Design a protein around this ligand. Structure first.
Ligand SMILES: [Mg+2]
Lengths: 122, 76, 147, 98, 148, 216, 130
């Protein structure tokens, strides 16, 4: 699960009862199968007594920062959406390294055009 | 033979120990072979009136029994 | 630590005879492990013990050839057969009987087994009943008092 | 703007892929005497990269997945050495040949 | 008895009438007489002694492989159906009437609710699976019955 | 002295249901098939005092789902050695209760092929009445037996014992302890631990279970 | 049945208890958990139990330990202390942490006299002796 992140910052209040998702993401991100997959990736835990709500703020390899609602969305939904954005970033990078422009644009009128079946030819 | 143990202690400076009479040994040694009861009796009793060690033996033998009854049925 | 644990392999070596070829040959060569430094560290601690004693050594192999081992006491089967009599287990244990030990040998064997490096906190009733369960498994009889 | 993506990996000694006209025509070399030409349908384009990887990129999920399976069906992986076209995340389980 | 294949050593008469077997029930219900589990019939018909022997052999061979050692013969089997009606038969290339034909085998008349087999000294699952194996050798529809 | 002694089993309070019935106006296979098609089991409640002249009988019908549930949950023999409350009303959902009485199921008829209930029989057993009750046996302690430990097999000769029982203290089952039986011995009907007010109908020198040696 | 097991396991441990804590046991193995339990069982007068959070939730109802309710989420190893000497109770975890180098397993939440001190707040109270 930890291939695509560079820094993660977890912040929450310890005496406020909505920390279940954020400590579950702590469990997800501090596993033995996680830290061996990216030794260079950094984790940042911060605790405070005041009422700043619990947040997960991540960054990726290509300078993109994403904040998530750790108060109302679960850690597993966070884990799914980080990979949903990560594979898009990887596809963008893989296209960009080979000399193709990103994003690739397709005319949005061929959805109405009829298409026959694709039969392979000699 | 029957008064000393052989090959028990392995410290080179010392020797194998001896057999002390029943003066230095505490109480729980001779309780080792009492009839700790089986699942035929503990199942029909009241769990709420059971003591701690007996209910621990009850749940442990229940877990062993359910594991055995899974493994003997589901095996092909 | 942070190293990717490969395997945990155990062995029994007599005390003082850590010559790295008859038991320390293919057993440690199957996992690319070294034979010199482990034998030096092994012979640097069994100098205060009686030799020709089957000491138990568990060694945690690694991918960087690092040895992180603890030394175990010799096996409770050895302790309960050599303090009893003939070292031959029964053909049908639980029904066919070889030797008999009453209350005392098992208790002091439990006292010795407490010296295991991760048995600092197990109670003597636990160790004694574990050894009783081992005693049931080769066919030896246990009584209240042999006379 | 494309949303739906699929990737294919080609394994083989001398097995090759090449896009021809703006990502609308796909050409393949699968060890035959001739080549294999497939016309990518509308709403889908194709791209080729430097790891023997073919990308099916498009806006209609049905056509993208159908065309990716179409390219796969030209040569499935063999069970003895895994040679052929396969999916990137797909695991091919081999067996020993007597 | 006669070892495996069960038929009487001798009879009063060599040839019997055909009779009817498609009807008949136990008018009082049925209960197990010796065992804890059993196989009973749901329909009425005929069973041959070879089929009964094949079913008994299937049950004893299933117990043989499930339970070994001193519990290998802890399973007990009772065969409560017995084949004592001879059936006859004329060979090929023979005309219709010159008497009655030679006997060829033995059958048993089975009613609706008759207990064919009884089992004891085994597990419930072993008894159910042995009944499942034995019912594939009989032409009639059978049910597993349990003591209660 | 008409109460269960301590150390004895008692009827369970889980299966202490009440049986609901409605009157039935005729006997015969016609009305029996009509009631079974409608989803009821024919039944009769009768008493002991006048065996001739009927016996103050009342013809009723009970609910098939309830009776099948009771027989499946208890067992066939256990249902027949336990008392029940019977409540006979004029209609289902009516409050005109005709007769509430404490009765014994004397017999139940099950189909030999489909095992659906065909007939239930109830006999009035108020306190002070004597019955012939067939009590099932329960065999315990088969893990403690030295004979069974040595590999011998168990020969259950009898499963139920017939007794003469006053209504108040009819045992649901008899617990038989097998802890102290080794190879060769048997238990007879005189070794059953019952109430002293129960009389054994069968002679006491009748074997019940024998532990026989295994094939060496 | 396990509900009654842990109900008894907390009913025995609440007979002499004066403060309660819960430790995040992420990354601790069985042997290190046993070593923590041993250190805190011989060298102190404390006991360790890993239990269902909702079951401790229900089993502490009607008691003066009813304020704890926010601090029962995630991975919780509940430590119940039957004694009063909190300096020797809380310095053992300092020795354990500095010896075996475990920063991922800390003290989240404690209850003393109807109050939930912050993990920073029950740091000075271990300095005061008796
Ligand atoms: Mg009539």
């Amino acid at each position: 699960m930890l291939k695509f992140l560079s820094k993660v910052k977890i912040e929450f209040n310890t005496l406020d009862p909505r920390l279940a998702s954020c400590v579950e993401f702590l469990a997800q991100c501090n596993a033995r199968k996680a830290k061996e997959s990216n030794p260079n990736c950094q984790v940042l835990v911060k605790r405070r007594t005041d009422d700043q709500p619990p947040q997960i703020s991540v960054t990726f390899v290509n300078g993109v920062e994403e904040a998530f609602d750790a108060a109302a969305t679960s850690a597993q939904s966070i884990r799914k959406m980080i990979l949903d954005k990560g594979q898009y970033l990887e596809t963008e990078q893989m296209f960009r390294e080979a000399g193709e422009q990103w994003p690739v644009i397709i005319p949005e009128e061929e959805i109405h055009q009829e298409a026959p079946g694709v039969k392979p030819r000699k | 033979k029957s008064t000393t143990v052989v090959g028990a202690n392995t410290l080179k400076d010392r020797s194998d120990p001896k057999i002390l009479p029943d003066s230095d040994y505490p109480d729980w040694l001779w309780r080792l072979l009492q009839i700790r009861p089986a699942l035929s009796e503990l199942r029909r009793k009241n769990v709420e009136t059971l003591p701690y060690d007996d209910l621990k033996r009850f749940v442990k033998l229940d877990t062993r029994a359910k594991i055995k009854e899974n493994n003997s049925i589901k095996a092909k | 630590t942070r190293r990717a644990v490969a395997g945990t392999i155990k062995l029994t070596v007599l005390a003082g005879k850590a010559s790295p070829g008859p038991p320390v040959s293919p057993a440690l060569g199957p996992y690319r492990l070294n034979m010199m430094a482990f034998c030096k560290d092994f012979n640097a601690r069994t100098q205060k013990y009686k030799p020709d004693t089957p000491m138990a050594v568990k060694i945690t192999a690694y991918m960087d050839h690092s040895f992180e081992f603890s030394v175990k006491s010799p096996t409770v089967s050895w302790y309960i057969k050599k303090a009893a009599g003939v070292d031959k287990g029964s053909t049908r244990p639980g029904h066919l009987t070889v030797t008999t030990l009453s209350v005392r040998h098992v208790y002091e064997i439990a006292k010795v087994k407490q010296t295991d490096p991760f048995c600092q906190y197990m109670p003597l009733e636990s160790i004694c009943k574990s050894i009783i369960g081992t005693a049931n498994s080769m066919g030896i009889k246990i009584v209240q008092d042999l006379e | 703007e494309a949303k739906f993506f699929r990737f294919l990996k080609i394994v083989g000694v001398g097995y090759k892929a090449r896009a021809e006209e703006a990502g609308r025509f796909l050409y393949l070399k699968l060890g035959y005497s001739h080549e294999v030409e497939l016309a990518v349908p509308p709403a889908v384009r194709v791209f080729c990269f430097k790891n023997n990887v073919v990308c099916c990129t498009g806006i209609d999920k049905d056509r993208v997945h159908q065309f990716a399976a179409t390219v796969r069906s030209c040569k499935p992986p063999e069970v003895y050495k895994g040679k052929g076209i396969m999916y990137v995340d797909e695991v091919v389980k081999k067996k020993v040949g007597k | 008895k006669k070892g495996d294949v069960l038929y009487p050593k001798r009879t009063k008469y060599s040839k019997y009438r055909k009779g009817r077997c498609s009807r008949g029930c136990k008018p009082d219900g049925t209960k197990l007489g010796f065992g804890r589990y059993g196989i009973k019939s749901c329909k009425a018909g005929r069973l041959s002694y070879r089929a009964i022997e094949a079913a008994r052999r299937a049950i004893i061979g299933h117990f043989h492989r499930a339970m070994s050692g001193q519990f290998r013969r802890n399973g007990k089997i009772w065969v409560r159906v017995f084949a004592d009606l001879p059936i006859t038969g004329k060979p090929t290339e023979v005309r219709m009437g010159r008497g009655k034909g030679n006997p060829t085998g033995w059958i048993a008349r089975v009613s609706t609710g008759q207990i064919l087999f009884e089992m004891d000294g085994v597990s419930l699952a072993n008894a159910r699976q042995a009944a499942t194996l034995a019912a594939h050798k009989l032409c009639l529809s059978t049910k597993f019955v349990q003591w209660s | 002295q008409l109460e269960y002694l301590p150390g004895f089993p008692r009827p369970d309070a889980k299966h202490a249901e009440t049986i609901l019935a409605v009157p039935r106006s005729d006997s015969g296979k016609n009305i029996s098939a009509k009631e079974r098609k409608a989803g009821r089991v024919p039944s009769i409640i009768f008493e002991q005092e006048d065996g001739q002249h009927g016996g103050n009988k009342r013809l009723v019908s009970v609910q098939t789902n309830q009776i099948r549930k009771l027989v499946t949950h208890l067992g066939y023999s256990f249902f027949l050695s336990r008392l029940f409350d019977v409540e006979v009303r004029s209609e289902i959902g009516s409050d005109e209760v005709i007769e509430k009485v404490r009765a014994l199921p004397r017999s139940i008829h099950l189909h030999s092929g489909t095992d659906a209930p065909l007939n239930v029989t109830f006999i009035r057993a108020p306190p002070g009445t004597l019955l012939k009750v067939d009590i099932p046996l329960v065999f315990i302690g088969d893990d403690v037996s030295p004979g069974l430990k040595k590999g011998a097999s168990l020969n259950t000769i009898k499963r139920t014992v017939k007794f003469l029982c006053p209504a108040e203290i009819v045992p649901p089952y008899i617990e038989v302890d097998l802890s102290l039986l080794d190879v060769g011995q048997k238990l007879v009907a005189g070794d059953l631990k019952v109430h002293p007010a129960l009389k054994l109908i069968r002679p006491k020198d009748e074997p019940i279970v024998k532990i026989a040696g295994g094939r060496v | 049945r396990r509900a009654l097991l842990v109900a008894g396991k907390t009913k025995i441990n609440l007979q002499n208890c004066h403060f309660i804590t819960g430790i995040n046991y992420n990354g601790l193995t069985v042997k290190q958990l046993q070593e923590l339990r041993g250190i805190l069982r011989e060298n102190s007068n404390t006991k360790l139990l890993v239990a269902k959070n909702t079951l401790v939730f229900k089993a502490l109802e009607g008691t003066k330990w009813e304020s704890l309710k926010p601090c029962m989420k995630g991975m919780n190893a509940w430590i119940f202390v039957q004694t009063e000497d909190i300096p020797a109770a809380l310095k053992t975890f300092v020795s354990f942490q500095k010896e075996k180098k475990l920063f991922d397993n800390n003290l989240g939440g404690a209850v003393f006299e109807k109050k939930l001190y912050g993990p920073q707040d029950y740091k000075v109270i271990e300095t005061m002796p008796s």
